[PDB]
Design a protein around this nucleic acid. Structure first.
Ligand SMILES: [Mg+2]
Ligand SMILES: [Mg+2]
Ligand SMILES: [Mg+2]
Ligand SMILES: [Mg+2]
Ligand SMILES: [Mg+2]
Ligand SMILES: [Mg+2]
Ligand SMILES: [Mg+2]
Ligand SMILES: [Mg+2]
Ligand SMILES: [Mg+2]
Ligand SMILES: [Mg+2]
Ligand SMILES: [Mg+2]
Ligand SMILES: [Mg+2]
Ligand SMILES: [Mg+2]
Ligand SMILES: [Mg+2]
Ligand SMILES: [Mg+2]
Ligand SMILES: [Mg+2]
Ligand SMILES: [Mg+2]
Ligand SMILES: [Mg+2]
Ligand SMILES: [Mg+2]
Ligand SMILES: [Mg+2]
Ligand SMILES: [Mg+2]
Ligand SMILES: [Mg+2]
Ligand SMILES: [Mg+2]
Ligand SMILES: [Mg+2]
Ligand SMILES: [Mg+2]
Ligand SMILES: [Mg+2]
Ligand SMILES: [Mg+2]
Ligand SMILES: [Mg+2]
Ligand SMILES: [Mg+2]
Ligand SMILES: [Mg+2]
Ligand SMILES: [Mg+2]
Ligand SMILES: [Mg+2]
Ligand SMILES: [Mg+2]
Ligand SMILES: [Mg+2]
Ligand SMILES: [Mg+2]
Ligand SMILES: [Mg+2]
Ligand SMILES: [Mg+2]
Ligand SMILES: [Mg+2]
Ligand SMILES: [Mg+2]
Ligand SMILES: [Mg+2]
Ligand SMILES: [Mg+2]
Ligand SMILES: [Mg+2]
Ligand SMILES: [Mg+2]
Ligand SMILES: [Mg+2]
Ligand SMILES: [Mg+2]
Ligand SMILES: [Mg+2]
Ligand SMILES: [Mg+2]
Ligand SMILES: [Mg+2]
Ligand SMILES: [Mg+2]
Ligand SMILES: [Mg+2]
Ligand SMILES: [Mg+2]
Ligand SMILES: [Mg+2]
Ligand SMILES: [Mg+2]
Ligand SMILES: [Mg+2]
Ligand SMILES: [Mg+2]
Ligand SMILES: [Mg+2]
Ligand SMILES: [Mg+2]
Ligand SMILES: [Mg+2]
Ligand SMILES: [Mg+2]
Ligand SMILES: [Mg+2]
Ligand SMILES: [Mg+2]
Ligand SMILES: [Mg+2]
Ligand SMILES: [Mg+2]
Ligand SMILES: [Mg+2]
Ligand SMILES: [Mg+2]
Ligand SMILES: [Mg+2]
Ligand SMILES: [Mg+2]
Ligand SMILES: [Mg+2]
Ligand SMILES: [Mg+2]
Ligand SMILES: [Mg+2]
Ligand SMILES: [Mg+2]
Ligand SMILES: [Mg+2]
Ligand SMILES: [Mg+2]
Ligand SMILES: [Mg+2]
Ligand SMILES: [Mg+2]
Ligand SMILES: [Mg+2]
Ligand SMILES: [Mg+2]
Ligand SMILES: [Mg+2]
Ligand SMILES: [Mg+2]
Ligand SMILES: [Mg+2]
Ligand SMILES: [Mg+2]
Ligand SMILES: [Mg+2]
Ligand SMILES: [Mg+2]
Ligand SMILES: [Mg+2]
Ligand SMILES: [Mg+2]
Ligand SMILES: [Mg+2]
Ligand SMILES: [Mg+2]
Ligand SMILES: [Mg+2]
Ligand SMILES: [Mg+2]
Ligand SMILES: [Mg+2]
Ligand SMILES: [Mg+2]
Ligand SMILES: [Mg+2]
Ligand SMILES: [Mg+2]
Ligand SMILES: [Mg+2]
Ligand SMILES: [Mg+2]
Ligand SMILES: [Mg+2]
Ligand SMILES: [Mg+2]
Ligand SMILES: [Mg+2]
Ligand SMILES: [Mg+2]
Ligand SMILES: [Mg+2]
Ligand SMILES: [Mg+2]
Ligand SMILES: [Mg+2]
Ligand SMILES: [Mg+2]
Ligand SMILES: [Mg+2]
Ligand SMILES: [Mg+2]
Ligand SMILES: [Mg+2]
Ligand SMILES: [Mg+2]
Ligand SMILES: [Mg+2]
Ligand SMILES: [Mg+2]
Ligand SMILES: [Mg+2]
Ligand SMILES: [Mg+2]
Ligand SMILES: [Mg+2]
Ligand SMILES: [Mg+2]
Ligand SMILES: [Mg+2]
Ligand SMILES: [Mg+2]
Ligand SMILES: [Mg+2]
Ligand SMILES: [Mg+2]
Ligand SMILES: [Mg+2]
Ligand SMILES: [Mg+2]
Ligand SMILES: [Mg+2]
Ligand SMILES: [Mg+2]
Ligand SMILES: [Mg+2]
Ligand SMILES: [Mg+2]
Ligand SMILES: [Mg+2]
Ligand SMILES: [Mg+2]
Ligand SMILES: [Mg+2]
Ligand SMILES: [Mg+2]
Ligand SMILES: [Mg+2]
Ligand SMILES: [Mg+2]
Ligand SMILES: [Mg+2]
Ligand SMILES: [Mg+2]
Ligand SMILES: [Mg+2]
Ligand SMILES: [Mg+2]
Ligand SMILES: [Mg+2]
Ligand SMILES: [Mg+2]
Ligand SMILES: [Mg+2]
Ligand SMILES: [Mg+2]
Ligand SMILES: [Mg+2]
Ligand SMILES: [Mg+2]
Ligand SMILES: [Mg+2]
Ligand SMILES: [Mg+2]
Ligand SMILES: [Mg+2]
Ligand SMILES: [Mg+2]
Ligand SMILES: [Mg+2]
Ligand SMILES: [Mg+2]
Ligand SMILES: [Mg+2]
Ligand SMILES: [Mg+2]
Ligand SMILES: [Mg+2]
Ligand SMILES: [Mg+2]
Ligand SMILES: [Mg+2]
Ligand SMILES: [Mg+2]
Ligand SMILES: [Mg+2]
Ligand SMILES: [Mg+2]
Ligand SMILES: [Mg+2]
Ligand SMILES: [Mg+2]
Ligand SMILES: [Mg+2]
Ligand SMILES: [Mg+2]
Ligand SMILES: [Mg+2]
Ligand SMILES: [Mg+2]
Ligand SMILES: [Mg+2]
Ligand SMILES: [Mg+2]
Ligand SMILES: [Mg+2]
Ligand SMILES: [Mg+2]
Ligand SMILES: [Mg+2]
Ligand SMILES: [Mg+2]
Ligand SMILES: [Mg+2]
Ligand SMILES: [Mg+2]
Ligand SMILES: [Mg+2]
Ligand SMILES: [Mg+2]
Ligand SMILES: [Mg+2]
Ligand SMILES: [Mg+2]
Ligand SMILES: [Mg+2]
Ligand SMILES: [Mg+2]
Ligand SMILES: [Mg+2]
Ligand SMILES: [Mg+2]
Ligand SMILES: [Mg+2]
Ligand SMILES: [Mg+2]
Ligand SMILES: [Mg+2]
Ligand SMILES: [Mg+2]
Ligand SMILES: [Mg+2]
Ligand SMILES: [Mg+2]
Ligand SMILES: [Mg+2]
Ligand SMILES: [Mg+2]
Ligand SMILES: [Mg+2]
Ligand SMILES: [Mg+2]
Ligand SMILES: [Mg+2]
Ligand SMILES: [Mg+2]
Ligand SMILES: [Mg+2]
Ligand SMILES: [Mg+2]
Ligand SMILES: [Mg+2]
Ligand SMILES: [Mg+2]
Ligand SMILES: [Mg+2]
Ligand SMILES: [Mg+2]
Ligand SMILES: [Mg+2]
Ligand SMILES: [Mg+2]
Ligand SMILES: [Mg+2]
Ligand SMILES: [Mg+2]
Ligand SMILES: [Mg+2]
Ligand SMILES: [Mg+2]
Ligand SMILES: [Mg+2]
Ligand SMILES: [Mg+2]
Ligand SMILES: [Mg+2]
Ligand SMILES: [Mg+2]
Ligand SMILES: [Mg+2]
Ligand SMILES: [Mg+2]
Ligand SMILES: [Mg+2]
Ligand SMILES: [Mg+2]
Ligand SMILES: [Mg+2]
Ligand SMILES: [Mg+2]
Ligand SMILES: [Mg+2]
Ligand SMILES: [Mg+2]
Ligand SMILES: [Mg+2]
Ligand SMILES: [Mg+2]
Ligand SMILES: [Mg+2]
Ligand SMILES: [Mg+2]
Ligand SMILES: [Mg+2]
Ligand SMILES: [Mg+2]
Ligand SMILES: [Mg+2]
Ligand SMILES: [Mg+2]
Ligand SMILES: [Mg+2]
Ligand SMILES: [Mg+2]
Lengths: 272, 47
RNA sequence: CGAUGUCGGCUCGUCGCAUCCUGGGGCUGAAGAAGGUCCCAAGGGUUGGGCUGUUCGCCCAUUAAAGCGGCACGCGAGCUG
RNA sequence: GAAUGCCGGCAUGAGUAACGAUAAAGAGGGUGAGAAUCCCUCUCGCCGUAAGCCCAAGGGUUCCUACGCAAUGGUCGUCAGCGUAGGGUUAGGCGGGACCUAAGGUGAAGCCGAAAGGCGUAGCCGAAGGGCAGCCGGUUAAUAUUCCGGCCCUUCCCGCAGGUGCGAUGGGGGGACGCUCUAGGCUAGGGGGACCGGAGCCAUGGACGAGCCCGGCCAGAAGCGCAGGGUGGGAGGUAGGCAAAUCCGCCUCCCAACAAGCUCUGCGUGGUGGGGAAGCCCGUACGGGUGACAACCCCCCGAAGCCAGGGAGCCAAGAAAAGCCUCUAAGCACAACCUGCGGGAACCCGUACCGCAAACCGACACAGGUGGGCGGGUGCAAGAGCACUCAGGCGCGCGGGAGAACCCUCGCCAAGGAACUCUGCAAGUUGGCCCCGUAACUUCGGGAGAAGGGGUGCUCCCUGGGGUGAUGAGCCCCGGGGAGCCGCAGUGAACAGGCUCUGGCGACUGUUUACCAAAAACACAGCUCUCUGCGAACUCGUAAGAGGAGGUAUAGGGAGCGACGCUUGCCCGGUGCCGGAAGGUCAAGGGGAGGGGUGCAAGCCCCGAACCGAAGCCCCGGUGAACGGCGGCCGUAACUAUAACGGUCCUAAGGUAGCGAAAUUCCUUGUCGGGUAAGUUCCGACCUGCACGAAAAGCGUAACGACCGGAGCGCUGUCUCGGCGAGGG
RNA sequence: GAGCUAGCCCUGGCCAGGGUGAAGCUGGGGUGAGACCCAGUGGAGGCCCGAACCGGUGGGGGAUGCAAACCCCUCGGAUGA
RNA sequence: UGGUUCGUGGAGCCAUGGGGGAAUCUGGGCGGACCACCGCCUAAGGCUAAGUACUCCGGGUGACCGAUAGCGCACCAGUAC
RNA sequence: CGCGGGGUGGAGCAGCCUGGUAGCUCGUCGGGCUCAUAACCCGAAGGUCGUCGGUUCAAAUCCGGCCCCCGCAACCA
RNA sequence: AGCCUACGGGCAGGCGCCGAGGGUAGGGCCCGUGACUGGGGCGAAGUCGUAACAAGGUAGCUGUACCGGAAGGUGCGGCUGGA
RNA sequence: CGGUGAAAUGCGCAGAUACCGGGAGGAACGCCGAUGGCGAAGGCAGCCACCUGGUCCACCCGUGACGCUGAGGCGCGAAAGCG
């Protein structure tokens, strides 16, 4: 349940902050993990590439175990649920009985002291990683690989979930959070359970401040630019965009599909 | 009000310096053009 | 067109008369008072506000009257804008 | 002889404008060929969270002294930041380097590019960040944490003395961190004192008095003392920390739970060293002496600074590396490393001076700009605000008279109060604190400082709380009640809201046309559409590579709308986009019916129709919070008027809700109603909407606005309608 | 050529003094348990007044200027985009 | 595709980026599509003086200048600024 | 004052470009159905094609002139 | 600073609180009134349609929601005052 | 092929309708079923488990008048509607 404010100043009657009750008494982070400073940058080697980024609070990166085949059959116990500012979801600190400490994406219902195992064994309960080959049909799964032994690259944001629908030979088909039925390999590891912190959907920023704090700089409409800047720009008061709506670079923005149709990955995709 | 020339030995040396001219092939001709006409100073005198 | 600043207001005026008043006068369908119209007459005077950027105009309260025009639609090396 | 010609010279305006903040000068005396302008003294004025001190950048001899005044100085000049010459900058501890890393730059391996060159892991470079050992005084005309004096430290290298498995750029810990609010004890700084030490002074009516005036400090090893920060100690087992570890990490019983103990700071006191006024006397620009054998004590206020890696709360979740401690690997365990002592060795660069400005950036000795620290006292509730004033520094490098117009900047005014005017533009009224008291509306926060009021000084009396002192006096912080005094007036000077009612737009804080526009424009939280399943879409680049992102549909891009409430209607005919293994057309290519050129012929060379031939287009469907569009003419009801009703025509469908003479209305100052004595503006209505209308959104909406309009109260030189006075010209 | 200007990255600094008083904590109340209501504490916020600081709203001055954007009064923000 | 006078032209020759792809004297290219005849050369490796171009440099000469001319500089000029 | 569309039976539209034909729907008139009306069924009439000319053998039709009606335009100072 | 007939007294007079009332400012309730506007009742033979009463020719009524010149229609659920 | 009183719109030679096989998803639970049952009403239906309330019978065991109603308040409250 996201916690709300009273209108003692404007832009707090709408502002909403996430419930931080599941974050246990581990508010500062864990060294020997998180060894990296995050490189702040909006631009590649010079020019800006993705527009309207900059500012925002300073962040240290938490390194996350997406390769859960490192520790097959080696259990761990959850000792912390922590805040990762690099992500929409929360992270969980695993103490392996092996002795090594690792961060993981924190699923829904995962509580502290619960132990979690990875591998072909490690029964079907939240937090455990298995290959998609062994997980029963109809179960809910996150942290899914698309190709085996390349890293978890699916169903990682808050509240997201992928559902196993069936098998075709050595491939398993998944309903992805978009609704796309994608046919991904059987040996791809994937962590059972939904992601959780699904209330990230409901948080209202209240003001421009919380966007600037997250590094979202003000987005400028093409209607208010000039014909040298944007296709929509120019004219006297509030031109109605005078053409099929386009990007600053000319490509149309409403309906024009932009994936390569000749992709080799198109014969693994079934739905929207 | 604040004007254009806000001096800095660091900036002047690292921008208009001999070791900066010698990196780029464009700045190498700046030295060629100045030696061939007889400039007493190929570089802004930075101290 | 190698530059003649444009409306309106303000300040300062000055001139024409085909005269709004005051002065003189003929006719009147002028009894008297108040009028009408025409002639002589410019010496002087020709209000304060509401609306509008406005000139003009419509109003309000008066007045002897609340005149029309010219002067680069007088006047920005005088003002405003 | 002309080209607003080029170059140089000299004229006119003209002894005219000006001489650079209205902080302000007067006299006496020196020097001097020459003094308003240089030096000295007395008097006056100005700054004083600076116009005063200390740094950094930048400037580069401007610093000090001697001799000088051609030019520089907006005048003069004996003066100078000016000319000639000489002198002056002293570091193991300050800053930087023989240390480290951040962004970024660079770059062996590697990738890429016609060439030049573009990337790029490790590494290297890269600093107000991390690390690291000096405090107090005195000397020079000019340097000092640099020289000197006292006290105190840091690295090495070489020796002896005592310990231990020693030992890496490798493993681990630590370094190491946000914002806001803050608790305890200190310190910096400050106020008072009958106490202590001092030259001196009793003036002009009074005072020989706990009188006046001035001063009552600084640093300081170990040891203590007081605050405070960091840390648990054993045993096993151990697959992880890319070899190995006894170290770290993970389990499992035992022992404390705590600063008890180990360190580590800070602050006092500490052997001892040093400083030390006012006033008086002199040979200088400047300092010297005595005052002193100086005293060097006690209270109170007290930080934003210290203990510091303190605590609490919150979300927007808060550098890296080296030094440092520990662990082992080669090797080595005669080596080596640790602790204590002794001796010796400690290099390079900066160091003057200006430094909110006459020395920097503005062509100028330019009213502009320039980052960090100290920035005293008194009063006003507080405060870096305001007024005066310590220390300190200035009177701004043209002056002297006059007392016109006119101008700037001021001050005041009879009666009237906006009649001024585009507009109360400007100017004025209000103005601090305490206490009453406060409407519609409201999103229940607000609106609110609504509005509108009252008290404000001084003296005397009684009396309630705290803080530091022991519960007490004292010093300080807040209060309550009573009785009186004076003036026109008590925030007695300076700093310090005019208020209300009602509309438009925009929700709001915010951004914008450096240098005529700050807005109703932009942005904004939030809504919707659409693309993108990850070597994502999109963006830069030929490429490599990179952003997106060390992200993964609750994510990322693009587009529009722009809090919030109630809503967003019909048209897919044309355009865009989306979906259609049919069909038509369709280029290269395949294919060869058939024909041509040469050969004596094998042959060689040309064309060349059926037919097979993609995307695209045509065709078929869909789609509006995609581009867009959303009718005309007639007649009809109990008087007149109008038309709920009907007829016909066309369209892809013919504007629904909600608004409406509006930021939209031409005719138009439309017509009614309200405000006025009078209202082309304003407000409320009607609807004949030239030419509103639903995300280029529609209608509303509390709060908000240096936005735009209308009105009213208070007040006023805006005006009737001017007058007087002041200072700079 | 980014020593002016715009944006972003790395690393430091600055924001006197007052007001208002959100969440949360303690106690009392309420209930069958709650919701919730009271005080006391607490000190939130692109909150309020207002210096430094950052701007540049209205007017006046300036116009071969002190100044190729200045000066005076007035004014906005001033813990945050 | 480029070069050549050749801009697709009857478009050869000479180089080529792309696809297919031989032969060794009875072998191969060329003589401006092409075919026959008649002739000329012998590709898919390389080197090679001299004659030719220029004038930082020294000399000779000038119906060249003579300090606003002649080089931007006759002068300590690529200086001051 | 300009540019281009239109005036056709009582109403609303066709027919014009390509001349010899004026058609559609409603309405009017007469008769059916009903008890009567509306609805419906059957059968009829009705147009100087805005006026003035000239073109042709012949004009709603083609060409000019006026009178009406509709739409756009009327800018830069 | 006055006047008194028996004076550490009396009167006149002065000051102070309260004070009817007048003024200023903001609220509460009520009454009249206003261009225009909503709906109501009645009125004469007006216009449009036929919703309900007979299975009223679509059984009716209802709460709600949306739409339509208007009765009204339709969606969801309910009722017997219907079969 | 759909559909109807009859038709039309519509769907389909791009391969519809009818048939088979597999897959996805959502809603409601046929037969039992009733003139039934349960609940204070609204209302409640495939099956399983857990947590849970009301209620009936016998035995006449204990308390022993603790009882009835109920303005307020409080909770529940079909369908439609709202975030
Ligand atoms: Mg680290
Ligand atoms: Mg880079
Ligand atoms: Mg670069
Ligand atoms: Mg935008
Ligand atoms: Mg624009
Ligand atoms: Mg551009
Ligand atoms: Mg364009
Ligand atoms: Mg363009
Ligand atoms: Mg002209
Ligand atoms: Mg001329
Ligand atoms: Mg006359
Ligand atoms: Mg007369
Ligand atoms: Mg007369
Ligand atoms: Mg008479
Ligand atoms: Mg007469
Ligand atoms: Mg006016
Ligand atoms: Mg005129
Ligand atoms: Mg005149
Ligand atoms: Mg004229
Ligand atoms: Mg004129
Ligand atoms: Mg002028
Ligand atoms: Mg004028
Ligand atoms: Mg104007
Ligand atoms: Mg103006
Ligand atoms: Mg001539
Ligand atoms: Mg000449
Ligand atoms: Mg000229
Ligand atoms: Mg000249
Ligand atoms: Mg002269
Ligand atoms: Mg003179
Ligand atoms: Mg003159
Ligand atoms: Mg003069
Ligand atoms: Mg003068
Ligand atoms: Mg001066
Ligand atoms: Mg003398
Ligand atoms: Mg420095
Ligand atoms: Mg320096
Ligand atoms: Mg200089
Ligand atoms: Mg010099
Ligand atoms: Mg000097
Ligand atoms: Mg001298
Ligand atoms: Mg001189
Ligand atoms: Mg000389
Ligand atoms: Mg001079
Ligand atoms: Mg000067
Ligand atoms: Mg002399
Ligand atoms: Mg000198
Ligand atoms: Mg060395
Ligand atoms: Mg060395
Ligand atoms: Mg180094
Ligand atoms: Mg290193
Ligand atoms: Mg190369
Ligand atoms: Mg490089
Ligand atoms: Mg380095
Ligand atoms: Mg370095
Ligand atoms: Mg450093
Ligand atoms: Mg440092
Ligand atoms: Mg140091
Ligand atoms: Mg000095
Ligand atoms: Mg010293
Ligand atoms: Mg060891
Ligand atoms: Mg070591
Ligand atoms: Mg480490
Ligand atoms: Mg390390
Ligand atoms: Mg001290
Ligand atoms: Mg002290
Ligand atoms: Mg004494
Ligand atoms: Mg005396
Ligand atoms: Mg003292
Ligand atoms: Mg001490
Ligand atoms: Mg232990
Ligand atoms: Mg190991
Ligand atoms: Mg403790
Ligand atoms: Mg000590
Ligand atoms: Mg002394
Ligand atoms: Mg002295
Ligand atoms: Mg802390
Ligand atoms: Mg390193
Ligand atoms: Mg240590
Ligand atoms: Mg020095
Ligand atoms: Mg110095
Ligand atoms: Mg300073
Ligand atoms: Mg200067
Ligand atoms: Mg200078
Ligand atoms: Mg200048
Ligand atoms: Mg000066
Ligand atoms: Mg200033
Ligand atoms: Mg400054
Ligand atoms: Mg201070
Ligand atoms: Mg002070
Ligand atoms: Mg006082
Ligand atoms: Mg104050
Ligand atoms: Mg301070
Ligand atoms: Mg003063
Ligand atoms: Mg002084
Ligand atoms: Mg001066
Ligand atoms: Mg006076
Ligand atoms: Mg007056
Ligand atoms: Mg008066
Ligand atoms: Mg008045
Ligand atoms: Mg007026
Ligand atoms: Mg007037
Ligand atoms: Mg106004
Ligand atoms: Mg004003
Ligand atoms: Mg006042
Ligand atoms: Mg009110
Ligand atoms: Mg209001
Ligand atoms: Mg309030
Ligand atoms: Mg008040
Ligand atoms: Mg108000
Ligand atoms: Mg007094
Ligand atoms: Mg105490
Ligand atoms: Mg104290
Ligand atoms: Mg008083
Ligand atoms: Mg004031
Ligand atoms: Mg308003
Ligand atoms: Mg308006
Ligand atoms: Mg501007
Ligand atoms: Mg400009
Ligand atoms: Mg503004
Ligand atoms: Mg919205
Ligand atoms: Mg790039
Ligand atoms: Mg590209
Ligand atoms: Mg990439
Ligand atoms: Mg990245
Ligand atoms: Mg987006
Ligand atoms: Mg999106
Ligand atoms: Mg918009
Ligand atoms: Mg907008
Ligand atoms: Mg509302
Ligand atoms: Mg719409
Ligand atoms: Mg359409
Ligand atoms: Mg379409
Ligand atoms: Mg279509
Ligand atoms: Mg279509
Ligand atoms: Mg298509
Ligand atoms: Mg072909
Ligand atoms: Mg062929
Ligand atoms: Mg095709
Ligand atoms: Mg009628
Ligand atoms: Mg009709
Ligand atoms: Mg409609
Ligand atoms: Mg309009
Ligand atoms: Mg008025
Ligand atoms: Mg009126
Ligand atoms: Mg009116
Ligand atoms: Mg109105
Ligand atoms: Mg209207
Ligand atoms: Mg609009
Ligand atoms: Mg729209
Ligand atoms: Mg809008
Ligand atoms: Mg509106
Ligand atoms: Mg709105
Ligand atoms: Mg509003
Ligand atoms: Mg505003
Ligand atoms: Mg604002
Ligand atoms: Mg207003
Ligand atoms: Mg005046
Ligand atoms: Mg005067
Ligand atoms: Mg004067
Ligand atoms: Mg810059
Ligand atoms: Mg910059
Ligand atoms: Mg505060
Ligand atoms: Mg509270
Ligand atoms: Mg606060
Ligand atoms: Mg604020
Ligand atoms: Mg504000
Ligand atoms: Mg303020
Ligand atoms: Mg400061
Ligand atoms: Mg600034
Ligand atoms: Mg201004
Ligand atoms: Mg402006
Ligand atoms: Mg101005
Ligand atoms: Mg304000
Ligand atoms: Mg403020
Ligand atoms: Mg060619
Ligand atoms: Mg060719
Ligand atoms: Mg050609
Ligand atoms: Mg050719
Ligand atoms: Mg080839
Ligand atoms: Mg060949
Ligand atoms: Mg050939
Ligand atoms: Mg040949
Ligand atoms: Mg030939
Ligand atoms: Mg040949
Ligand atoms: Mg050869
Ligand atoms: Mg060769
Ligand atoms: Mg040659
Ligand atoms: Mg020569
Ligand atoms: Mg020359
Ligand atoms: Mg000569
Ligand atoms: Mg027609
Ligand atoms: Mg027609
Ligand atoms: Mg009939
Ligand atoms: Mg009938
Ligand atoms: Mg023009
Ligand atoms: Mg134009
Ligand atoms: Mg007595
Ligand atoms: Mg009395
Ligand atoms: Mg009273
Ligand atoms: Mg009263
Ligand atoms: Mg009273
Ligand atoms: Mg009275
Ligand atoms: Mg009253
Ligand atoms: Mg009341
Ligand atoms: Mg009323
Ligand atoms: Mg019915
Ligand atoms: Mg019926
Ligand atoms: Mg019925
Ligand atoms: Mg219903
Ligand atoms: Mg319907
Ligand atoms: Mg029903
Ligand atoms: Mg019935
Ligand atoms: Mg029945
Ligand atoms: Mg099937
Ligand atoms: Mg579905
Ligand atoms: Mg039960
Ligand atoms: Mg019994
Ligand atoms: Mg429901
Ligand atoms: Mg719903
Ligand atoms: Mg709705």
């Amino acid at each position: 349940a996201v916690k709300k404010f009273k209108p003692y100043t404007p832009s707090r009657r709408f502002m909403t902050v996430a419930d931080f009750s599941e974050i246990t008494k581990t508010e500062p982070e864990k060294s020997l993990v998180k060894p990296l400073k995050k490189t702040g940058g909006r631009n590649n080697q010079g020019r800006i590439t993705v527009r309207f980024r900059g500012g925002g609070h300073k962040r240290l990166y938490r390194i996350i175990d997406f390769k859960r085949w490192d520790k097959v059959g080696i259990p761990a116990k959850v000792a912390a649920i922590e805040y990762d500012p690099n992500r929409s979801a929360r992270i969980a600190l695993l103490h392996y009985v092996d002795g090594e400490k690792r961060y993981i994406i924190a699923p829904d219902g995962l509580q502290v002291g619960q132990q979690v195992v990875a591998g072909p064994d490690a029964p079907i309960q939240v937090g455990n990683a298995l290959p998609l080959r062994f997980i029963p049909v109809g179960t809910v799964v996150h942290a899914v690989e698309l190709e085996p032994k390349k890293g978890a690259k699916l169903a990682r944001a808050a509240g997201t979930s992928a559902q196993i629908q069936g098998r075709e030979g050595d491939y398993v088909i998944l309903r992805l959070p978009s609704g796309e039925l994608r046919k991904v390999h059987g040996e791809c590891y994937a962590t059972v359970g939904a992601v959780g912190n699904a209330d990230h959907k409901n948080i209202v920023l209240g003001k421009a401040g919380r966007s600037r704090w997250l590094g979202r700089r003000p987005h400028v409409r093409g209607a208010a630019m000039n014909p040298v800047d944007h296709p929509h720009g120019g004219g006297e008061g509030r031109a109605p965009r005078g053409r099929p709506p386009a990007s600053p670079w000319g490509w149309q923005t409403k309906g024009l599909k932009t994936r390569k149709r000749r992709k080799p990955s198109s014969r693994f995709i079934i739905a929207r | 009000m604040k004007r254009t020339w806000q001096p800095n030995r660091r900036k002047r040396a690292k921008t208009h310096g001999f070791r900066a001219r010698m990196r780029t092939p464009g700045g190498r001709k700046v030295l060629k053009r100045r030696r061939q006409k007889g400039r007493w100073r190929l570089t802004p005198a930075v101290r």
